[PDB]
Amino acid sequence: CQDVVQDVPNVDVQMLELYDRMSFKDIDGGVWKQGWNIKYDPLKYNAHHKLKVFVVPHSHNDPGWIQTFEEYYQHDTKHILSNALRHLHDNPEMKFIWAEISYFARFYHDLGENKKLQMKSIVKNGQLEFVTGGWVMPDEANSHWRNVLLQLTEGQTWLKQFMNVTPTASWAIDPFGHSPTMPYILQKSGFKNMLIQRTHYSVKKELAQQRQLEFLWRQIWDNKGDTALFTHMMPFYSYDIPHTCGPDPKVCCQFDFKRMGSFGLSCPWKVPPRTISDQNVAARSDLLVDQWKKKAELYRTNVLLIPLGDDFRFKQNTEWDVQRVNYERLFEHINSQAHFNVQAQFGTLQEYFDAVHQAERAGQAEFPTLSGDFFTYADRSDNYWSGYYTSRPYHKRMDRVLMHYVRAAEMLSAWHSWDGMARIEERLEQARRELSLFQHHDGITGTAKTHVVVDYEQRMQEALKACQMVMQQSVYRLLTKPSIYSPDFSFSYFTLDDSRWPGSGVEDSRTTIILGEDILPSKHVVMHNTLPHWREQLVDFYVSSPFVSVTDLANNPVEAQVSPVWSWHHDTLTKTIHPQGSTTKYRIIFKARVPPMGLATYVLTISDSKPEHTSYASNLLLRKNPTSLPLGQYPEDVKFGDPREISLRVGNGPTLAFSEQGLLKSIQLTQDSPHVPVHFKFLKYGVRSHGDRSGAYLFLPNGPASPVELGQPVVLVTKGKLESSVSVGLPSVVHQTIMRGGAPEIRNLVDIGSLDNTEIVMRLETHIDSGDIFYTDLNGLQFIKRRRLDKLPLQANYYPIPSGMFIEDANTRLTLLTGQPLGGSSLASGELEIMQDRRLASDDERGLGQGVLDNKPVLHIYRLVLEKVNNCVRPSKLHPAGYLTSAAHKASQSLLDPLDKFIFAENEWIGAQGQFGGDHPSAREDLDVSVMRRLTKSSAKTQRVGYVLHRTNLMQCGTPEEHTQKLDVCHLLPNVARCERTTLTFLQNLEHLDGMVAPEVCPMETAAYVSSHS
Ligand SMILES: *[C@@H]1O[C@H](CO)[C@@H](O)[C@H](O)[C@H]1NC(C)=O
Ligand SMILES: N[C@H]1[C@@H](O)[C@@H](O)[C@@H](O)[C@H]1O
């Protein structure tokens, strides 16, 4: 295993180093506005060395943006695919690349058999080529790597099954900025090449000048280079035709033959395309070939890529003709005019890459090595695209919830083979597909129109219900004596209980367990733990009486705590935000202990008075002018007081101090240690009154943020033996700090209501001497070092926070882990800040045509980990990566993959068992079974189960932490007959494994295995 901490990779281009050196001046470069006047030596190309040009036709089809997926499919995409089928069938040399499998599968299944055969034939012969092959072209900023892999797998599994092809070249022309997580997953999924486009105009200029637009992109920690994936970055401002034939859009626009008028399109540079004829072909070719030769100077080989397309292009038959015919005339002239020394033709993406590598092997070029990312993107001037790191945060949080429910549903149901009547495969496929669709770059990014966002939300809601159905049927089968198990596949044996989604104050959706002497004395609940190690975690349920006690299935008592059910209300009468307690439902909390990838059953039983092993939290409402808060039979009366500073400590955990406004002011790790200053503050960013306005994509603040005026907020303090908390009703945010004995959990119920042109940010102020350095993660997979650059505007220093961020000095680190992707930064030494929601009245001129005014209450969740790191073995100062500690990693897992909770729905569960998985191996803490998926239906004689194993890398900080078992996924199911290492999509076998044993992976590596069972 490579060491991912101690050896700084030696690469030709390291993006953080490049950023430190670059000046980012935005000067007018001439017709290439963001470049310079390119010059070339006409003698470079000659009879023995021609310029091979590949014109690659394409059509960018968004699975939802301005229209929903289905509206685009009906109005545009089905016609584009239908006409592509006809036109390619009829014109053997014409080519076309297709990226979005969600649309392709939708089309293909509607085709009659004769057309399915013609489509397979044009794919088989190479005229229509799939690029990437994922369900969508995902966002690369907010998406979790697990969902990037799920959607890639959903589209490639469909392509292998129906088209018998697996793309090895990727095409990502539209995500707003690019992540090295893509080459990471692709190279482990059989890919050999990838293409990207949206990178900062200054980066395009800088790499173009050194001919470093093509590079072997390796991971920032990869010293050997085995993760490297050849990458081509497009050089210009857009992937449309005006910005893909060469440096001058006024000339390239003349070669988009769809712009002559009848299609309603035109050239903004005021010179229209003209139909190619024998009288103008020499002059038109001379213009086009000169653009091509200028583009060619930016690359190292004699093979040139010329994409030919734009959004939802190649829809009409007349459009196919007008582009194909005019280009065929140009190629016939150019290729027969030796003085151009060019051979041009229609080609596919793979053809371009194969020819580039042939040039490379012939010794004509060597490519530079590069590591780093391409965030934060700016397409022009100071318009940095950091706003979409936060836009539509309710759905960004929903993304993470469904991410987990999909994994849990696939894992719980993988243990058995199911009869087709159970509709398990059906429900799982629907859930994987709706979550995969939302990975689109207008889905999770929050850049779609309002009704499209609603469509993604409905799809995800149906996916969540599908996951629940599968999960609860699976729990019932796993925990019921087999000879008693009598399933009704449409029945709800259990309902899931989720404390954080939609979240208290977002939706009253949780059911109350109703117990009573005259109706039902007890109720079974079951917890599932998707992680491969024993895990304990507090779980809570609503119950109809405070006198409830908990036992495990051996009837051993379990210590429990009951707290009131508090809801916050914006009282329109008193004009205050304050909590009301329920006088009929209460919260019971207890520690559940669950086996690796397993289940554990508990029983809640009512009694007529306080049970022996249940304690009751005290509650203290701090506000001036209080009124009574009765709580029904809750046994402890609520106490009141004027606002004041308070201090809490749960268990042996840290002691946290709060200000009289209910916000954290310090954390004391142990009895003796100092009260380290850590202050939470809420501020607001506004919008500029002149110049460019912030919108769903762009963040253009009118300066640093201003403090939210807090007034004298109501603060609620609940203190319990297992859980305590401090909650405060601030303008737009009920902010809650929850303590259970370790790093606190923070929850914000964010309702920006009608505060127009406002962005609400949560900031942490510490005295940590971080300077200009901070770390943020990429797709929940790795942490990358960031350096605040005062030479760039505030919004350029915002980066995606898909799951965590941290600051540190020689001795102290503060890590903020998130349960949803949001945007954030460290704008001054010792600070961390992360945007909660943004409500923008204006459109930001990128085509959405509306602002963001559809905000809804969202419950954001986090874990805040303050730690001493002076003893940790950290990467040197020059290493571009950072790594979490064991505590920060476990806190991230507590947010993203919590225990699942199930409540038995009927009155009695006959045949109930108390546990599943007690014999599953409890793997080392840095290993995860990211995916467990049965790959075969019940009629397959040989069953197959796939696993994706991911090992993260945690800092060595001196804690011995051993005693774990080797996890061999190939032996998790019995009767194994074969074990293979496969690509991450499970589509290709890479290694037949000895002894049918799946070795564990190295730190920061991910591997996939498939076990076969007789
Ligand atoms: C699928 O593609 C492979 C590779 O070209 C070919 O050999 C095979 O016959 C095709 N159809 C099958 C057998 O699935
Ligand atoms: N090019 C446009 C469409 O393709 C959408 O994805 C927009 O967000 C924009 O990028």
Ligand SMILES: [Zn+2]
């Ligand atoms: Zn797009």
